[PDB]
Task: inverse folding
């Protein structure tokens, strides 16, 4: 089954590029933190 | 479990190993590689 967390990562990564494309660099830097946090949890071990 | 996903997972593991060993320059380099590879992997491409 698809991870909703993986989709959340894809979405925030896309959002970061979209925000950058509008010059919203302060929002970008906060979203980068969120992206890194979501990846940190996604790449933890289940077992 | 795909090869490019596993690669990112493993870099992430190595980041935490390097942090636990206080290797700041190693961490910085690994983070750079992780972010580059993340970009390519998680972008939804044509
Ligand atoms: Zn982490
Ligand atoms: Zn990117």
Result:
């Amino acid at each position: 089954s698809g991870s909703p967390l993986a989709q959340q990562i894809k979405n925030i990564h896309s959002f970061i590029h979209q925000a950058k494309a509008a010059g919203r660099m302060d929002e970008v830097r906060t979203l980068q933190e969120n992206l890194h946090q979501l990846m940190h949890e996604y790449f933890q071990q289940s077992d």
About this structure: Chain B has two helices and no strands. Chain B has one domain: 1-46. Residues 24-42 of chain B form the longest helix (19 residues).
